[PDB]
Amino acid sequence: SIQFVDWCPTGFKVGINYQPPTVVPGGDLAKVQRAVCMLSNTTAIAEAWARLDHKFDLMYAKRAFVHWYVGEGMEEGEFSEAREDMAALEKDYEEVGVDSVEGEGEEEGEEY
Amino acid sequence: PDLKNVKSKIGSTENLKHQPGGGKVQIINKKLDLSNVQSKCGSKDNIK
Numbered sequence: 001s002i003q004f005v006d007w008c009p010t011g012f013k014v015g016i017n018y019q020p021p022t023v024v025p026g027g028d029l030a031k032v033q034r035a036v037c038m039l040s041n042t043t044a045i046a047e048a049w050a051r052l053d054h055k056f057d058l059m060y061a062k063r064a065f066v067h068w069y070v071g072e073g074m075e076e077g078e079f080s081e082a083r084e085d086m087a088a089l090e091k092d093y094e095e096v097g098v099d100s101v102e103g104e105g106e107e108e109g110e111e112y
Numbered sequence: 113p114d115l116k117n118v119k120s121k122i123g124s125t126e127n128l129k130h131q132p133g134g135g136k137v138q139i140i141n142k143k144l145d146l147s148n149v150q151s152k153c154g155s156k157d158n159i160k
Binding site for chain 1: 113115118119120121122123124125128
């Protein structure tokens with residue numbers, strides 16, 4: 001129920017060191033015999049990148065603040081170049097969420 | 113605004129021709145030829 005991608009055949013990596021976490025003065029952690037860093041690659045962040053790309057759109061539609069950048073010698077074509085790249089990403093993060101489905105329609109059984 | 117066309121890059125959409133395809137296996141068996149063979153002692157005809 002901690003959902004991995006459906007396609008996943010393998011999806012963990014391990015690493016182990018003897019040194020524990022260390023206390024710094026002024027610090028905020030408790031002193032402990034053991035610890036874990038974790039890095040997770042996941043499809044979920046992509047919706048938070050739609051939040052930011054919608055926060056881009058809503059200003060760009062108003063050319064809000066745009067002049068601060070054109071005068072620096074880059075274009076309004078250079079916003080849309082970088083904007084079109086966020087769309088290729090949004091649309092590929094969708095693709096790596098896919099349940100290995102590559103079909104076109106849907107199909108049904110016998111019910112009453 | 114308008115984006116006209118945009119698409120994903122790069123994964124399962126670029127794989128759709130190559131399965132890959134499978135194969136076939138076989139045994140791994142023979143016989144031997146027995147057609148030359150006779151017993152190497154042989155006195156019973158000496159009844160003659």
